[PDB]
């Protein structure tokens, strides 16, 4: 019953492991092994569900075990020791073959294979922990093991591609346990989590390994948002060591999401609007990106309202993301009219929902924007309008108070008008036809460069498959 | 079939509490007469919410009667030897019984049997449409959408010119009922000529609706040719009140007497838009558009006007004008700004080189988006 | 004015009629709008050809 299932399950894994193993040890084609390693994990995660998941335990018994046996034991001990065939050497299905691990010769140190098997074994272990939620003890111990094991080795480029997945897991398990409920011991370890991924940024930069660099940068920036030091992020982000050379389009989308948040609060929407839209396109569009898709829509609503733009009514209506975008919808209307009263009621009533995603922080600041946006629209409609008429409409106290919020606004050229107080109206500053003006030359200049960039891109890339095909044997 | 559109529109006046109390109860007497006549017991339960068990006994009875009638018939017919032809004609009579009682679901089932045994392609199209009609009866437009799709698959498979005329009108009603009034304007003006009376909302109704879709969509120029000088509309004259109200409105627009336009607008809102079910939901869309389109035409003919002068002509106050116009400016058809102090409404419209610059720069930006998306994709793959 | 038989504008504030005839509009750009229009169909077709890569 139980043994047969685990064995078959183990066998399935053994097949996959062997493919990727051969692949790394036969010439250099790094990119292909890496893609294989990504699929292997998912296949194994879907697998576990069925044919039992103590197939890992089986493989541990039947490999060369330096400290993986004791780690595995540690794992069962957390979830109460269940032994049933868990003693090393009680399976030998290698059988000392030169086709599937030579048991004697590795021990002797004429051939070495514990390298890669170790790196893979920790990866399997982490996958199992997160799926189950075997957190607590195992997390600290894991972090402890992997760091001297991976630094024991003279780091390749190959090896670096595997460990950039391990680094993510260390970070995740520590965080998740933390938000469940605070502990003192959890903050002691926080200091240590920051210091290790940060030191490693330099190591990864010498090796110029693209996967590792990308990963570390995302984690460090997340860390800064958690603790609220915007300042630290500024120094870090001036230098851009973020590769965009070969990394997963998914990492690119994650990077841009950080940038948006930070810039927005530093009062820039020029960059923010570009990066959250850019991220949507970069991000896949599967049923595994529902999280990501939803939250991008949420941050972008805020960015536009902050600048003074009114987002499409159509954007929230025709979405299937309307259910969630219920607070955002209400904001949009309040702002539009310049009605102050509605805005107070909206922001108080939806405090909790906005506070989850920390968009609440942005919403206090939309108090300025309620009054200002109603006046953008009123100047548009009425060209010359007495301060008296403005005051009555939007409830604003007196002609002197309205003049002050407007005077500031036009410096920044939001409203684009000029005040005449010695007559008593405010007169919109027209630009009318801009073709007549010299505006189009600047528009063109940029676009030409974008076209030019795609041509060069086409050309380098086109050659890439061709070089491969020629060299291979053909009939 | 035929009674269903009549029943539903009367039911809809009763639902509304907007219309005059007189009309609401005048409609009560009339819907009641047809409720009894057709035995609407399953369907009465839908209608009684939205504004005798005998109707039900009468029902159930009508059930075993009309229900049994067709049953044993259907069986003698399945026993008798011609399978293709005889069974299917009988299943058409089966679908008629459910269609009398206003149950759209069981009507679909038996009419499906009718199709199943092979019948004339043309005949299949008649049958699909019958089901489609019952979708208007409930006011389930989603139901109509899918039914009408299956007809257009078979319309050119058959070559039927005969069923193409019906489809035009039903599809007119579909487009009319939905928010897109563009397709409606086209489909329905050509359904005037090719009107087929058979199971459809009267000829008088169609003519009114064509005018409505005409006004929303079509340019001043394009109204003149296609609606005003439209030979049919002139053949049909103005007899029904609704036709008169909408027609008169059209005329004073072209002739640009704006003393008589705004009184007609009030009339069309009361008597045409609100009582028609389709145009109850679109009342808002249509009246906002009409206000913007008339005001746009008058601004085009004036570099400058007074607020008092524009208002006085309409027969609305200076205060009233000032609010109603400031709704319409940011949606941008009016293309004007108002100097409050001088009271002038100056009009600024581009017609120069700027027109040809905007169109170019926007279209060419839409093209670049596509090049990037597609290029970058193919490199990866 | 609306018929476009002499298309002008009437300023009431001065009680004057200015009449305008043949307003200038870029002809170069008129030819370019049809050219961009073709390019847009073409990129949809090309991708469809390139659906074989997937």
């Amino acid at each position: 019953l139980h043994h047969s299932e685990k064995k078959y399950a183990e066998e399935d894994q053994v097949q996959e492991l062997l493919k990727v193993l051969n692949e790394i040890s036969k010439t250099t084609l790094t990119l292909d092994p890496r893609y294989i390693w990504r699929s292997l994990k998912d296949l194994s995660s879907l697998r576990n569900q069925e044919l039992l998941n103590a197939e890992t335990l089986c493989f541990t018994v039947n490999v060369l075990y330096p400290d993986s046996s004791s780690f595995k034991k540690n794992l069962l001990k957390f979830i109460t020791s269940n032994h049933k065939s868990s003693v090393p050497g009680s399976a030998e299905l290698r059988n000392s073959y030169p086709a599937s691990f030579y048991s004697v010769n590795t021990e002797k140190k004429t051939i070495e294979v514990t390298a890669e098997i170790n790196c893979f074994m920790h990866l399997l272990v982490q996958l199992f922990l997160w799926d189950s939620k075997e957190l607590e003890q195992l997390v600290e111990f894991n972090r402890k093991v992997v760091i001297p094991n991976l630094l024991c080795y003279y780091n390749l480029r190959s090896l670096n591609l595997i460990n950039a997945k391990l680094w993510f897991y260390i970070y995740l398990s520590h965080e998740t346990l933390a938000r469940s409920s605070e502990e003192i011991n959890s903050d002691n370890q926080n200091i240590i989590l920051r210091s290790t991924m940060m030191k490693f940024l330099k190591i990864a930069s010498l090796k110029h390994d693209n996967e590792t660099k990308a990963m570390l940068i995302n984690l460090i920036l997340r860390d800064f948002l958690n603790n609220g030091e915007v300042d630290s992020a500024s120094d870090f982000i001036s230098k851009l060591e973020y590769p965009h050379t070969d990394v997963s389009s998914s990492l690119e989308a994650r990077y841009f999401f950080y940038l948006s948040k930070i810039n927005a609060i530093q009062l820039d929407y020029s960059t923010a609007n570009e990066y959250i839209i850019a991220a949507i396109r970069k991000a896949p569009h599967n049923s595994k990106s529902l999280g990501f898709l939803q939250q991008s829509n949420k941050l972008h609503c805020c960015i536009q309202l902050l600048m003074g733009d009114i987002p499409e009514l159509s954007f929230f209506h025709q979405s299937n993301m309307q259910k969630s975008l219920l607070p955002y919808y209400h904001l949009t209307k309040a702002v539009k009219l310049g009605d102050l009263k509605k805005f107070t009621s909206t922001i108080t009533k939806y405090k909790q929902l906005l506070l989850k995603d920390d968009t609440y922080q942005l919403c206090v600041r939309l108090r300025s924007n309620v009054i200002k946006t109603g006046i953008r629209i009123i100047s548009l409609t009425y060209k010359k309008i007495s301060l008296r008429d403005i005051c009555l409409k939007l409830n604003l106290d007196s002609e002197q108070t309205v003049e002050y919020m407007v005077s500031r606004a036009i410096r920044d050229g939001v409203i684009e008008a000029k005040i005449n107080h010695e007559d008593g109206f405010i007169e919109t500053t027209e630009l009318l036809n801009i073709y007549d003006s010299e505006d189009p030359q600047q528009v063109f200049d940029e676009r030409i460069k974008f076209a030019n960039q795609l041509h060069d891109e086409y050309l380098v890339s086109m050659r890439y498959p061709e070089d491969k095909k020629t060299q291979q044997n053909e009939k | 079939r035929v009674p269903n559109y009549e029943v539903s529109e009367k039911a809809f006046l009763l639902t509304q509490s907007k219309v005059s109390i007189e009309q609401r109860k005048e409609a009560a007497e009339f819907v009641l007469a047809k409720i009894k006549e057709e035995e609407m017991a399953p369907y009465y339960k839908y209608l009684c919410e939205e504004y005798d068990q005998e109707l039900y006994n009468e029902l159930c009875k009508k059930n075993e009667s009309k229900i049994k009638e067709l049953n044993e018939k259907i069986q003698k017919l399945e026993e008798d030897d011609e399978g293709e032809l005889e069974q299917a004609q009988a299943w058409i009579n089966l679908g008629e019984y459910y269609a009398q009682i206003g149950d759209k679901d069981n009507a679909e089932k038996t009419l499906g049997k009718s199709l199943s045994k092979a019948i004339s392609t043309g005949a299949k199209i008649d049958v699909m449409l019958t089901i489609a009609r019952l979708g208007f009866f409930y006011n389930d437009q989603l139901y109509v959408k899918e039914k009408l799709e299956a007809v257009n698959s078979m319309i050119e498979k058959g070559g039927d010119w005969e069923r193409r005329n019906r489809y035009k009108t039903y599809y007119g009603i579909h487009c009319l009922a939905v928010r897109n009034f563009k397709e409606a304007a086209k489909l329905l003006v050509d359904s005037l000529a090719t009107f087929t009376s058979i199971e459809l909302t009267s000829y008088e109704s169609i003519a009114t609706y064509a005018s409505v879709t005409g006004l929303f969509t079509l340019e001043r120029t394009d109204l003149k040719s296609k609606v005003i000088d439209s030979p049919e509309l002139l053949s049909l004259i103005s007899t029904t009140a609704a036709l008169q109200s909408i027609s008169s409105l059209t005329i004073s627009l072209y002739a640009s007497d704006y003393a008589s336009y705004f009184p007609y607008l009030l009339e069309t809102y009361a008597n045409v838009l609100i009582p028609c079910k389709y145009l109850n939901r679109h009342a808002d869309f249509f009246v906002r558009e009409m206000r913007r389109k008339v005001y746009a035409q008058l601004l085009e003919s004036y570099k400058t006007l007074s607020l008092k002068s524009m208002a006085s002509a309409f027969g609305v106050s200076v205060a009233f004008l000032d609010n109603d116009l400031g709704k319409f400016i940011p949606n941008k058809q009016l293309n004007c700004v108002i100097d409050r102090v001088n009271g002038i409404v100056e009009t600024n419209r581009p017609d120069n080189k700027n027109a040809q610059y905007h169109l170019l720069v926007k279209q060419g930006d839409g093209l670049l988006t596509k090049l990037q998306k597609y290029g970058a994709a193919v490199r990866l793959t | 004015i609306l018929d476009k038989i002499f298309y002008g504008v009437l300023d009431q504030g001065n009680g004057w009629l200015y009449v305008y005839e043949t307003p200038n509009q870029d002809a170069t750009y008129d030819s370019a709008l049809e050219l961009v229009g073709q390019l847009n169909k073409v990129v949809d077709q090309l991708f469809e050809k390139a659906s074989v890569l997937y």
């Binding site: 086409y458 086109m462 498959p465 061709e466 095909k469 044997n473 053909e474 009939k475 | 193919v378 | 074989v52």
Partner: peptide, 27 residues
């Protein structure tokens, strides 16, 4: 031109695999 040369490559993969396949059949 990207597409056209690219389509050729995809086919080139197939002709290459065949070479190996055809060698097996004579052996």
């Amino acid at each position: 031109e990207l597409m056209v040369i690219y389509i050729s490559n995809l086919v080139r993969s197939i002709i290459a695999f065949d070479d190996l396949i055809e060698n097996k059949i004579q052996n």
